[PDB]
Design a protein around this motif. Structure first.
Motif, PDB file in Angstrom:
ATOM      1  N   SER A 101      19.299  72.105  41.886  1.00 17.32           N
ATOM      2  CA  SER A 101      19.521  71.079  42.904  1.00 17.32           C
ATOM      3  C   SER A 101      20.850  71.232  43.641  1.00 17.32           C
ATOM      4  O   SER A 101      20.948  70.884  44.815  1.00 17.32           O
ATOM      5  N   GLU A 133      25.146  68.078  38.867  1.00 14.80           N
ATOM      6  CA  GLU A 133      25.129  69.098  37.814  1.00 14.80           C
ATOM      7  C   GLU A 133      24.858  70.469  38.449  1.00 14.80           C
ATOM      8  O   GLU A 133      24.094  70.582  39.410  1.00 14.80           O
ATOM      9  N   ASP A 170      23.787  74.482  38.087  1.00 16.63           N
ATOM     10  CA  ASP A 170      23.069  75.494  37.326  1.00 16.63           C
ATOM     11  C   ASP A 170      23.452  76.899  37.766  1.00 16.63           C
ATOM     12  O   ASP A 170      23.205  77.292  38.910  1.00 16.63           O
TER      13      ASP A 170
HETATM   14 MG   LIG Z   1      20.176  70.612  38.246  1.00 14.09          MG
END
Ligand SMILES: [Mg+2]
Ligand SMILES: Nc1ncnc2c1ncn2[C@@H]1O[C@H](COP(=O)(O)OP(=O)(O)OP(=O)(O)O)[C@@H](O)[C@H]1O
Lengths: 437, 437
Positions: B47, B59, B61
Motif C-alpha cells: 500500500s 506501514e 513493505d
Molecule cells: Mg501494507
RNA sequence: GCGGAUCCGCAC
RNA sequence: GCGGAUCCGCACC
RNA sequence: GCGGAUCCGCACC
RNA sequence: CGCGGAUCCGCAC
C-alpha cells in the motif's frame, strides 16, 4: 427343577373343573335337543367343541349351515329366528350376518348363520371360515387339548393372549395351530426361542421359512396371516419369555401378576430422583368399544409424543390408561423447562426482498447472520412440556383419533406433580418408568 | 446527506495528511540508503509503494529478492540478518514465512525476504506473488488511490478489513483489485449488492461469472482465489452493508462503532428474561501468534459447541474473546438442566447373546422392549451444560487445538452468572445475544 | 497452526 | 467419539 | 344390507 | 382429502 411338575401344577390353573364341564355338556345336550326340534342343519365349533377352552371361559358356538343359494338377507332372518327360538335369553349383534348371543342353562351361547360351502375357496366372510378352521383342527388337535390350555394360560398370565386391539397378542386359533405344528407346549416354547420378526410358520406345507414379517399361514387360506395382529413388541416379549422359561422354569410364568402398588410419596421421590417431567392428559372416555378406543389412544399418544419430540422436550416414553369414566395419556420428558428464546430461520443473505421483510419484524433482539443465512431470536409460546401439550391438544384435537379427539375437544385436563399420583394411573407410571417391585 | 457529499466528507477521515506522508517519505529514503549500502536486491511493494495506505495505518513493505539457488534455510538466515541490520528496533514474530517486523524513525516497516522468479507460477515461498501484484497494480491503480482508501475505510470501520484469521475479511490487495475491476468505490458497492456465494470476479478477463464459491481470480495466477479467506458470513455482511448504504447513505458507515457498554445488572436481567444458560470457559492465552491462536479458539469453540449439541443442551450460539492474559469461550444454551435419566439403546430382541449381556448390567430401573429392540434407563454423569463442559474440557482437552488444548489442560475455569458479567466479555455477550442499544 | 481430501489405528 | 499420517489449501507480506 | 375405528397403499411435481 | 386393502370389532340404514 422338574419342568414336568410345574406343567402338572399349571394344568390345575387352566383345565375346567368337573362342574364347569358338566354345566357345558348339559347346555350342549339341551341346545342340540332344541335345534333338532327345528329340523335345522348346524355345527358346534370353537374351543368348547374341541375341548380346548380355558378354565372360566366356557362358551358354546353353534354355526347354522344354510344353502349357498340363500340370499344374505334370508340368512340373517332365518338365523335370527332360530337363535331367538333356541336360547333362554338372547341379544342380537354384528351386521352382515348379524348373530344371536344368549344363554342356555346358565351357559353363554353364540348362534351364527353362515353358508355351508364345499370348499374353503368360496369364502365371502370370516365366519364362513370358522367352520373350516374347526374342521381342520378337530382330529389334528385330539390328544393335545391340554397342551393348548398350557399355552393359552402361559400367554394370558403374561398379558399377550387375544388378537383384539386392546392386547395385540396371540389368538386362540393361533395357539391351536402352534400346538399342531410343534406337538406340545414346551416344544413350542423351545422353538419359539429362535423365532425372528421374519419367521414364517406354514402349518399345511409342513415347514418354516423366512418372509417379510412374522406370518403364520392359515392352513385353510394360504394368503391369511393368523398372527396378523400380533405386535412386534409382543412377539419380542413372548420369545424373551420362552428363553427365560427354559433357563429357569417356574409356576410363576402361569400366574397373573398383581401391580406394584406403592405409596405416592415413594413415587414422588422416584420422579424427583429421575429429574423428569411427568404428566397426564385426562379426558372423558368416549362411549365406544375397546377395539376402536385402544388404537385411538395409541394414535393420540403417538401424535403428542411426536409433538414433544419436535418441540425439543425430549420425551422418554408414553403410556395410556382407560378407566370406565376417564382416559389418561401419560408422558415422561427429559426437559422440564426450555428457554424462552429460540432461533427462527430466515432467508439467505442474497434474497433482498425477503431479507428486508425478515428484518422488518419488531423483535426484542437483533437478527444475525450465520453460515450465509439470516436468523432471529424469537420467544417461545410455551416453555414447559405441560404447557406445550395444553396448546397442541386444544389446537390439534382432530388429529388425536376420531372419537378421542372429539372428547379432548370438549374437555381435557393436564395433570402433573403430586396431583397426578392421586389419579388411578400408578401402575402405568411404574411400568412406564421401569420401577422395580 | 447524499452519497457524493458523504464520500467527500469520508475522504477527510480516510486520506492521510502531509504530516504523515512526510514521515513515510523520510522513513523510505532512510531505509533506501541503508539497503543501498549493503548492496542487496530490494523492492518497495504494498500500500505504501502505491500510495493506497489508510489514514493512521502507515506501514512499509520492503521485499528482498533472492535467487532460486538458495534453499529455505539460507533464505531465512540472510533475510532476517538484513532486516535486523536495516531496522532501528525489530521483532521476529511469524507463523510460517520468515520476516522482520520493526520501525524506522517512528514508522512501521516489514522487511520480507522472497524469491525472484521469472514468472509467478510454481512458487517457492508463499509471498512470491507480491512483487508481481505490485507490477500488475502500479499504473492500473493510478487515479484510483483514494477510491481504494474509501473502500478500505468502509471495511475497516465495519470490522471486516484484513484477510488474517482474526478477521477473515477483505485484504488490501483484494480492495485494489475490486477498485481496478469496478473503477470506483460506489460502483463496487452498487455491484456488490448483487454478489452471491457463487460469484466469480475475473479481473484479468474483465468478467463476472458463476462458479462453485465466491472467487476473485488473481490476475497474476488464475488458480489463486484472492478472497480465499473471506468468510461466507463476512461476504454476507458486506453485501448487506452495501444495500443499506445505497438505501440510506451516511458518514457513520466510515466511522468506528463504540462498544455497547452496559451494566452487569441489565445484562443479568436480559439473561433471566431469555431463560438460557450463559457461561464461559476461561483459560490462559497461549504465547503464540494470532494466526495460530484464532483458528484454535475457533476449533475449541466448535468442539465444545458440538459436545453441547450431542448432549442435548441445545446451544444457540458461541463466541470467543482473547485478551492479553486470558482467552474466553462463550456459550448460550436453551437447556439449563436436563433429567438425570436417559435412554441407552440395546440389541434387537433376536440377538440372544447381546440381549443377555445388556440385561445383566445392574440398573436402578427395568429395561424395556420398544419396536423390537431393548432399551434401558441409565443415569447421566452431569445434568447442566456447565457440568457437561467441565467434564468434556477436563477429558478432551487434547482435541481443542494444539496450543489452546494444552493450556486448557494446565488450567481452565467455567464461569457463569454474576461472576461472568464482571469478566471483560460484555461486548461479546451482547453481540452473541443480539442486545440492542 | 487451522481447514479440506485421502489413508491407518483405536472406541462403537 | 477420538488418535496418527500424507498431500493440498489458507493465515503470518 | 350396512356400520365403526386404526394402520398401510394409491392419486396430486 | 378421498378411494382401496389389511386388521380388530359392532348391529346398520
Ligand atoms: Mg501494507
Ligand atoms: N492475504 C493476501 N492475499 C494476497 N496478497 C497479499 C496478502 N497479504 C499480503 N499480500 C501481498 O503483499 C502486499 C503487502 O501486504 P499487506 O498485508 O501489507 O497489505 P497492503 O496491500 O500493503 O495494504 P495495507 O498495508 O494498507 O493494509 C499486498 O499488496 C499483496 O500484494
Amino acid at each position: 427343577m422338574k419342568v414336568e411338575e410345574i406343567l402338572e401344577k399349571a394344568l390345575e390353573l387352566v383345565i375346567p373343573d368337573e362342574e364347569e364341564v358338566r354345566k357345558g355338556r348339559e347346555a350342549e345336550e339341551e341346545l342340540r335337543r332344541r335345534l333338532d326340534e327345528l329340523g335345522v342343519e348346524y355345527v358346534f365349533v370353537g374351543s368348547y367343541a374341541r375341548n380346548t377352552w380355558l378354565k372360566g371361559s366356557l362358551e358354546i358356538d353353534v354355526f347354522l349351515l344354510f344353502p349357498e343359494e340363500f340370499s344374505k338377507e334370508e340368512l340373517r332372518e332365518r338365523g335370527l329366528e332360530i337363535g331367538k327360538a333356541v336360547l333362554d335369553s338372547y341379544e342380537i349383534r354384528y351386521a352382515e350376518h348379524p348373530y344371536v348371543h344368549g344363554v342356555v342353562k346358565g351357559v353363554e351361547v353364540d348362534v351364527v348363520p353362515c353358508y355351508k360351502l364345499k370348499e374353503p375357496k368360496n369364502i365371502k366372510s370370516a365366519v364362513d371360515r370358522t367352520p373350516f378352521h374347526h374342521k381342520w383342527l378337530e382330529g389334528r388337535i385330539k390328544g393335545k387339548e391340554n397342551e393348548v390350555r398350557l399355552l393359552k394360560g402361559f400367554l394370558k398370565a403374561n398379558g399377550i393372549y387375544g388378537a383384539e386391539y386392546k392386547v395385540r397378542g396371540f389368538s386362540g386359533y393361533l395357539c391351536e395351530l402352534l400346538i399342531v405344528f410343534y406337538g406340545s407346549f414346551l416344544e413350542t416354547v423351545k422353538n419359539a426361542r429362535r423365532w425372528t420378526r421374519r419367521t414364517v410358520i406354514d402349518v399345511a406345507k409342513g415347514e418354516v421359512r423366512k418372509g417379510e414379517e412374522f406370518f403364520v399361514v392359515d392352513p385353510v387360506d394360504e394368503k391369511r396371516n393368523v398372527a396378523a395382529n400380533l405386535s412386534l413388541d409382543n412377539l419380542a416379549r413372548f420369545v424373551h419369555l420362552c428363553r427365560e422359561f427354559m433357563e429357569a422354569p417356574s409356576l410363576g410364568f402361569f400366574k397373573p401378576k398383581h401391580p406394584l402398588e406403592i405409596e405416592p410419596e415413594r413415587l414422588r421421590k422416584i420422579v424427583e430422583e429421575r429429574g423428569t417431567a411427568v404428566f397426564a392428559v385426562k379426558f372423558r372416555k368416549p362411549d365406544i368399544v375397546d377395539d376402536n378406543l385402544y388404537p385411538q389412544l395409541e394414535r393420540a399418544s403417538r401424535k403428542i409424543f411426536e409433538f414433544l419430540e419436535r418441540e425439543n422436550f425430549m420425551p422418554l416414553r408414553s403410556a395410556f390408561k382407560a378407566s370406565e369414566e376417564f382416559c389418561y395419556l401419560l408422558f415422561e420428558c427429559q426437559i422440564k423447562e426450555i428457554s424462552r428464546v429460540f432461533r427462527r430461520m430466515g432467508p439467505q443473505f442474497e434474497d433482498e426482498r425477503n431479507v428486508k421483510k425478515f428484518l422488518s419484524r419488531n423483535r426484542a433482539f437483533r437478527p444475525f447472520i450465520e453460515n450465509g443465512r439470516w436468523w432471529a431470536f424469537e420467544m417461545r409460546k410455551f416453555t414447559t412440556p405441560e404447557e406445550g401439550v395444553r396448546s397442541y391438544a386444544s389446537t390439534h384435537w382432530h388429529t388425536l383419533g376420531k372419537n378421542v379427539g372429539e372428547s379432548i375437544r370438549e374437555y381435557f385436563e393436564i395433570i402433573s406433580g403430586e396431583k397426578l399420583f392421586k389419579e388411578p394411573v400408578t401402575a402405568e407410571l411404574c411400568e412406564m418408568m421401569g420401577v422395580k417391585d
